[PDB]
Amino acid sequence: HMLSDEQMQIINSLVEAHHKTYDDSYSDFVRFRPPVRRLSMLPHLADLVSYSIQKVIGFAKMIPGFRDLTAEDQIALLKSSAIEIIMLRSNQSFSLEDMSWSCGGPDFKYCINDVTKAGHTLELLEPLVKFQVGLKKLKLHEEEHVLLMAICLLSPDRPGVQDHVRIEALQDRLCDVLQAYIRIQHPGGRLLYAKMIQKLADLRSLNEEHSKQYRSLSFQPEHSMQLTPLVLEVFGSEV
Amino acid sequence: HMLSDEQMQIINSLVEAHHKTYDDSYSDFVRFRPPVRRLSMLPHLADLVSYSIQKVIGFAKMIPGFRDLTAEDQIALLKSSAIEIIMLRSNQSFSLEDMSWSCGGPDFKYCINDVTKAGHTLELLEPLVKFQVGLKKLKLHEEEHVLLMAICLLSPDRPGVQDHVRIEALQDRLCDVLQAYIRIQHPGGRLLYAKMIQKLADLRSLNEEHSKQYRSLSFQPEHSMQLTPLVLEVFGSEV
């Protein structure tokens, strides 16, 4: 009926980690290869995703429990959840008004048509925009957001995890914290935790769609050369 | 005592290939990751070198004789001569006035101190600036320049070449053309061909110094992630 001391520590630790790794200004984007509007936007998005992966890794490094997993396990979670955590954190920039990620002026405003000049299909971008709208509407607290991210990342059903029991133990402790939080701290959310866990199942389809289309990119050597070594390590299959 | 029809074709083919692959404006540099002044300039230089490698490959594709070599041989020449051809073509941008490559305003003016923020040593940058000055002073015709480049690239003494006899046969035909050219077309160059062949021996030392320092870069995973996949293919040892 009231948040415990250990549940409160987990929330402080996660909120801080997000703040330490999410620049709400998007000021570092001027360091990426400029966007252009033969896969025109692919340089800029690969730099964008590469930068994000580094922030996701820094966040994960601070989820309580994550550091003590084997390095193999840590890599296995990152490699599979990477794109999912990105789509998740990217919701803070998605604007319902124009239905686009707004990270700057005309330059860093990514609308549905630009990601088409990046090797992905207008047709399979449908669920991604849909996902971002339904999540925007969930009006999540920063605590629920950061919590959902850590839960997504700590899924024991990723290819490569060995200690799927410890990772499961970590992920349930984080769900308890979340149910508690919504329950004692989020009025009107009698149905919100289920709505949130539903979003997790959506992300796996997105993750799946992206893997099929990124494989198409990484198998054409003229497109993969536009990727970054981090991107190719993370989304490649060298495990 | 007069250039032959076949020697003239080789010159036309090489001059055109250079023009088709060297933008004297440096206008595409705005597409590279911006220069910054922890290896500050390394993103921009890796993009610069990566772009150059693509122009070198396009030039090589048009050196008569090159296309008919096996793909293994073509790769072997490129992987070893790459940095040398770059230092060679880059002389067109080196300015004796301020002793720096001038490719734009304050942004794309690379002076000796900037390449220091790119993982290389002030101490071993000495021969490179020295090489560029002595070559600038040679006041080479565009024909002698393009010819010197093709000769550098067609050296049969590269690690990996299998048909070191055909590549040697190609490289001598190109030297004949060059000696002829200087002889019947470059007044006052009674000593120039030897001066030019000397520059080739210098490039191997530069090539050597760079390989030792790039290996240091590619062995630190925080610096290699700033490289490009093309750069890592070309200067890596995956043969």
């Binding site: 890794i57 840590q74 890599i75 990152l78 981090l230 390590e233 060298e238 | 995973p221 290699s224 992630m225």
Partner: peptide, 10 residues
């Protein structure tokens, strides 16, 4: 290989 991922996890 994962050279970079290992580095990035301090």
């Amino acid at each position: 290989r994962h050279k970079i991922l290992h580095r990035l996890l301090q």
